[PDB]
From a paper:
[name] ([name]) is a cytosolic enzyme that catalyzes the N-methylation of nicotinamide by transferring a methyl group from S-adenosyl-L-methionine (SAM) to nicotinamide (NA) resulting in the formation of 1-methyl-nicotinamide (MNA) and S-adenosyl-L-homocysteine (SAH). [name] is implicated in various disease conditions such as metabolic disorders, neurodegenerative diseases and cancer, and tissue [name] expression or plasma levels of its product MNA have been proposed as biomarkers for these conditions. Human and mouse [name] proteins are very similar in size, consisting both of 264 amino acid residues. The biologically active unit is a monomer.
JBSNF-000088 inhibited human [name] (hNNMT), monkey [name] (mkNNMT), and mouse [name] (mNNMT) enzymatic activities with IC50 values of 1.8, 2.8, and 5.0 µM, respectively. Based on these results, crystallization was carried out in the presence of JBSNF-000088 and SAM at molar ratios of enzyme:SAM:compound ~1:5:10 for human [name] & at molar ratio of enzyme:SAM:compound ~1:10:20 for mouse [name]. Co-crystals were obtained with JBSNF-000088 for both human and mouse [name] enzymes and X-ray crystal structures were determined at 2.48 Å and 1.99 Å resolution in P21 and P212121 space group, respectively. JBSNF-000088 was found to be methylated in the human and mouse [name] structures with the cofactor SAM correspondingly being demethylated to SAH. The binding environment of the methylated compound is very similar in human and mouse [name]. The methylated product is bound below the hairpin structural motif at the nicotinamide pocket, and its pyridine ring stacks between Tyr-204 (from hairpin) and Leu-164. The amide moiety is recognized by two Ser residues from the hairpin (Ser-201 and Ser-213). In the binding site of mouse [name], a further interaction, though probably weaker, is observed between the amino group of the amide and Ser-247. The methyl group of methylated JBSNF-000088 is in close proximity (~3.4 Å) to the sulfur atom of SAH. Therefore, JBSNF-000088 may act as a competitive substrate analog that is very slowly converted to its N-methylated product.
Author numbering: 5 to 260
The structure:
């Protein structure tokens, strides 16, 4: 199983973004998954009771797509990742640097989803404004943010991270417990991840995944104490040879 060290030495943020999040003419399977992810996140953050002051995103990588609807419902956002170069790629975009990844097509799509009450540049400004901190994190640690003093979060978000970070089910359960240390009683856990995937690719670079069915995900989350408020299966697959996933899931849990 892919180690933490392999992420540091092999994960190329710009390549990752180009292959999965360009929302262009190529990578059509990847485009379809992204549309569905954005639809589910819109419903989770804009149509429900998932709102509050502070949201902490765990394992953000170099991406912001998972935060676009969230910033309508949360005033403060903290993003975090294990991999230093991912955080720097994120910063390129936050600081509006030349050469930052083009998120426009994604931003436009979310604006469309939210009824066009807002144009692209306004949405991008609002997200930049909401993101308060960009921090190192390690989900495998009892104190995932290195024990920095932060208020307990109203929402804990993690997309496409836990399957990649956990070599087996005991490790997956431990990571779930670890994340809970950051969340208020009554707070929301929002999770997205691949189903039944044992790997994903960034070009030639292969990264491990823990293959889990939706029932197994449900049980692990429920055994961690969460009341599952929402759970959806996304029945789309990544491109052949890109992953062996059979769909993805999204879920909303509430901490007792
Ligand atoms: N032990 C760990 N703790 C926190 N993050 C980890 C981790 N091991 C791997 N990761 C991160 O998990 C991410 C998987 S790529 C997922 C990126 C983004 N959240 C998206 O939805 O596309 C990588 O950015 C990697 O750095
Ligand atoms: C697009 O990024 C990803 C795709 C599939 C993954 C998996 N666990 O199969 C993980 N992952 C980060």
């Amino acid at each position: 199983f892919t180690s933490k060290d392999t992420y540091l030495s092999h994960f190329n943020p710009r390549d990752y973004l180009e292959k999965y999040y360009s929302f262009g003419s190529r990578h059509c399977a990847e485009n379809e998954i992204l549309r569905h992810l954005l639809k589910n996140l819109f419903k989770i953050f804009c149509l429900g009771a998932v709102k509050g002051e502070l949201l902490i995103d765990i394992g953000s990588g170099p991406t912001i797509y998972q935060l676009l609807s969230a910033c309508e419902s949360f005033t403060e956002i903290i993003v975090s990742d294990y991999t230093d170069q991912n955080l720097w790629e994120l910063q390129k975009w936050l600081k509006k640097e030349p050469g930052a990844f083009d998120w426009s097509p994604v931003v436009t799509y979310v604006c469309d989803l939210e009824g066009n009450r807002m144009k692209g540049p306004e949405k991008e400004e609002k997200l930049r404004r909401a993101i308060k901190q960009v921090l190192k994190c390690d989900v495998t640690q009892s104190q995932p943010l290195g024990g920095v003093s932060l208020p307990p979060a109203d929402c804990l978000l993690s997309t496409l991270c836990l399957d990649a970070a956990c070599p087996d089910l005991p490790a997956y359960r431990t990571a779930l417990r670890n994340l809970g240390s950051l969340l208020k009683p009554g707070g929301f856990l929002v999770m997205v991840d691949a189903l039944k995937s044992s790997y994903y690719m960034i070009g030639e670079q292969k990264f491990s995944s823990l293959p889990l069915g939706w029932e197994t995900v449900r049980d692990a989350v429920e055994e961690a104490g969460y009341t599952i408020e929402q759970f959806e299966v996304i029945s789309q697959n990544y491109s052949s040879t890109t992953s062996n996933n059979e769909g993805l899931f999204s879920l909303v849990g509430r901490k007792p």
